[PDB]
């Protein structure tokens, strides 16, 4: 079949070997590329293996539709943002209709209010805050 015998690879040369079984290019940051890994791995279902290895190693990841970003666990940042004239159900429908709604890092807040609380990867929070302060200003 297939697989990848890794010997002291350094997590940037390791996820690119999985970047064919995953059909998206994988971008790993700089602090999460110092940890190393050995062993014989086998790619036959990558979305079930990347979930297990993101908990045993300690990482966070995110798939936006064109690539897969990977950071380590100590890089998560948070944000508390407020809206003036749109509620949470319109914004949640914008993510469900656009396709950027991630079920592992959801939005915590009141369902009919202006304020909520976001916490996730740094490319996810920087997108939700920008698309929230650029949507209420349209009206």
């Amino acid at each position: 079949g297939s697989g990848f015998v890794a010997k002291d690879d350094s997590l940037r040369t390791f996820f690119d070997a999985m970047a064919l079984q995953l059909k998206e290019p994988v971008i790993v940051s700089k602090m999460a590329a110092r940890k190393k890994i050995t062993g014989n791995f086998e790619f036959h279902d990558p979305n079930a293996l990347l979930e297990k290895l993101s908990l045993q190693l300690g990482l966070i990841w995110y798939f936006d539709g064109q690539a897969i970003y990977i950071y380590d666990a100590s890089e998560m940042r948070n944000a508390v943002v407020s809206l003036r004239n749109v509620s949470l159900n319109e914004f949640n429908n914008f993510l469900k209709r656009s396709g950027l709604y991630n079920k592992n890092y959801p939005l915590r807040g009141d369902n009919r209010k202006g304020t909520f609380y976001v916490s996730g990867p740094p490319v996810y929070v920087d997108m939700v805050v920008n698309a929230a302060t650029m949507m209420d200003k349209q009206n």
Binding site: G1, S2, G3, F4, K7, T13, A17
Partner: peptide
């Protein structure tokens, strides 16, 4: 064989000569 080299075996194979060097022999 392939003493300290990481490779991606099976029907589309390569040998990593370095962190930035790909070698494409017979499918390992």
């Amino acid at each position: 064989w392939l003493k300290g080299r990481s490779f991606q075996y099976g029907a589309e194979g390569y040998i990593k000569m370095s962190p930035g060097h790909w070698y494409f022999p017979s499918p390992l």
